[PDB]
Write a protein that binds this ligand. Structure first.
Ligand code: K3S
Ligand code: K3S
Lengths: 304, 304
C-alpha cells in the first residue's frame, strides 16, 4: 500500500551522462553508442544567447573545441553535427554502459523521470509531466542543461526530453533527442511566455483511482455525469477536455475498483466545485495530475 | 530554479539488490561485500508471522535453504546469522558493484531515498522522511520487503532503512541495517498502532526558505515571534517543537535569503492559523515537511 511520486531507477541513465565544455560553458551530454548529445547553446556566450545564429557560430568550432569528459577520462571527438537544437558529437569510443534505448517524442500529459546533472554528474532524480502548454516544472540550476528525461520499459530506456531553457516565469523548456523543442520555445534569451497550464484531467482521474485502491475513499459520492457535462465543468476549471480515448485508457482502473469512469468524473466534478474542505487525498491538498493511468497501474502492480 | 521532491540517483544501490527466497517467500536482499542483508521474516510462513520464534524457526534452516539470485546468476551461501531483525547471508562472492558505504541510524525528521524493488529488481525511486512516530509513508506492495533507504554523500552510500512491515493503517515500519526497528514496531502480524504523526517543523521552515529562494513569497508577513511563542502554536497544530539546534541548522538559509529564522517562524505561524486560503507554495496546498535544511541547501546549490 501507499502511493508515491516515483521516478524510474536512474542507474541506466547515470551510465550515459558526460560533461561537455565549449569555451567557458560546461553542461551535460548524453553518451549513447559513439554519439554525445547536448544542447547546441553550449557554443553560445550568454551574449550570443540574445540573438544566436547557430550555423554561423558553429563555422568557428572544430571537433577539438568540444571537450567531452566521462568520469575523469577525456573522450576524443571525431565529428560533430547540428540536428535541430542539439549537437551530436561523434566520439571514437562507444559508451560501454549504453543501455537498450529509443528516442521518443511524448505528448502533453505524459510523465517521465529527470536525472538532474551538473558537470556530467548526477545530483538527483524526480518525476515530471509534459504540461499541456509544453513546459515542464523541473528543478534545474545553471549547469543542468543537457540533463535528460526518460521512461524505462523493463531494460529499454526511452529518452524523451533534454533540458535547454528556463523561462522568465521559472518553468522549463527543452527538446526531444532529435533536438525539436516541445511547444513553441526557442533556444534564445528572448520574451517567451507559456500559455495556460491546464490540469491533465485523465491523470487526475488515474490518481483518484490510485487513492481508492490505497483506501482514500472519502471523496466518492453518489453521482455520475456524462463526458459532455463533465467537460463543461472541466473547461470552467482549466482542466483538459476528457475524451473517449481517456475513458478507454482508464478502463483497467475502472475494472479493478468497480467504479465506472463517469462516476469517478462526477466525484472529480464535486471536488472541483466544492474544493477539498481542508481534507487530503493520498497526502495531497490539491488534485495531482503527474501520474498517468499507466503510472498508477505500474506502481499499483509493482512492475520492474 | 524550481524545487522538486528529489531522490538520490539510485544506480549505486541498484547494483546491490538481489532476490532472496526461503521456501515460498521471495523478497529483496542488499548485497555489500560478501554479505546479503534481508529481513529475517523471509523464514516465516504468513502463519508463522502471527507469533514467530525466529531463533526456533532458524534452527530448521540451512545455508542451502537461502536462495540468493543476483540478476540471473545464483550466489552460493556459505553462512548465515541473525542480527536483531535482519539476516546476514555470507556468500562466496564479494559484490563487484559494492559502493563505498556506511550503515547509519537516522533520527525522526531525516529524509532518505527508497529504491522500491520486487524479486531483486528495482521498480522505482522516491524520497521519504522518518516520521516523528518512526513510521515512513512509503509505496510498498507484497515482495517489496528488503527494499532499502539511503542517502549519498558524493560516492558513499549511507544505508539507513530496510523495509519490513505494513501496519494495518497502511504506513510502513522497518529497520536500520543492524536490524533494529525504527520506533516500537516488531516483525510480527499483531496490533501495532502508530502514535501521532506530527509535522517536522524544521523541514517546513527549510521548505519555506526554498520557496522564497524560488520566488514564491506571498506568505511572507510583517511579523516575528519567539521560539516559546511559536512552540505554543506548533504544539496546538501537532508540529514538532522548534529548538535552538533547529534555528542554528537553518542559519545558512537565513543568511542566503536575509529572512531571520524567527521571522519565517512568524510566517509559518500565520499559515497555521489562517491556512493557505486556496493558494499554493512550490505547487503544494499543504506545508511540505519532507525536505531537510540540508536537502534545501543541496538542491538549491546543485551538489553531485
Ligand atoms: C557542420 C557539421 N560538420 C562539422 C565537422 C567538421 N569535422 C571534421 N567534423 N565535423
Ligand atoms: C545461528 C546462525 N548460524 C547458522 C549457520 C550454520 N552454518 C553452517 N552457517 N551458518
Amino acid at each position: 500500500s501507499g502511493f508515491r511520486k516515483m521516478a524510474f531507477p536512474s542507474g541506466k541513465v547515470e551510465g550515459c551522462m558526460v560533461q561537455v565544455t565549449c569555451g567557458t560553458t560546461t553542461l551535460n551530454g548524453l553518451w549513447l553508442d559513439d554519439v554525445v548529445y547536448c544542447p547546441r547553446h553550449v557554443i553560445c556566450t550568454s551574449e550570443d544567447m540574445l540573438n544566436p545564429n547557430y550555423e554561423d557560430l558553429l563555422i568557428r568550432k572544430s571537433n577539438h573545441n568540444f571537450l567531452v569528459q566521462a568520469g575523469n577520462v577525456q573522450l576524443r571527438v571525431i565529428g560533430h553535427s547540428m540536428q535541430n537544437c542539439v549537437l551530436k558529437l561523434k566520439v571514437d569510443t562507444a559508451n560501454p554502459k549504453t543501455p537498450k534505448y529509443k528516442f521518443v517524442r511524448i505528448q502533453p500529459g505524459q510523465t517521465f523521470s529527470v536525472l538532474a546533472c551538473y558537470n556530467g554528474s548526477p545530483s538527483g532524480v524526480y518525476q515530471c509531466a509534459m504540461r499541456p502548454n509544453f513546459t515542464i516544472k523541473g528543478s534545474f540550476l545553471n549547469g543542468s542543461c543537457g540533463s535528460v528525461g526518460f521512461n524505462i520499459d523493463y531494460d529499454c530506456v526511452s529518452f524523451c526530453y533534454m533540458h535547454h531553457m528556463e523561462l522568465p516565469t521559472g518553468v522549463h523548456a527543452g527538446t526531444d533527442l532529435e533536438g525539436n523543442f516541445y511547444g513553441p520555445f526557442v533556444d534564445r534569451q528572448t520574451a517567451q511566455a507559456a500559455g495556460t497550464d491546464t490540469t491533465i484531467t485523465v491523470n487526475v482521474l488515474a490518481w483518484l483511482y490510485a487513492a481508492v485502491i490505497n483506501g482514500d475513499r472519502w471523496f466518492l459520492n453518489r453521482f455520475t455525469t456524462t463526458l459532455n457535462d463533465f467537460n463543461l465543468v472541466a473547461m470552467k476549471y482549466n482542466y483538459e477536455p476528457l475524451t473517449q480515448d481517456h475513458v478507454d485508457i482508464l478502463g483497467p482502473l475502472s475494472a479493478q475498483t468497480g467504479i465506472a469512469v463517469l462516476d469517478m468524473c462526477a466525484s472529480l466534478k464535486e471536488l472541483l466545485q466544492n474544493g477539498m474542505n481542508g481534507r487530503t487525498i493520498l497526502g495531497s491538498a490539491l488534485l495531482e495530475d503527474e501520474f498517468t493511468p499507466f503510472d498508477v497501474v505500474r506502481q499499483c502492480s509493482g512492475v520492474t
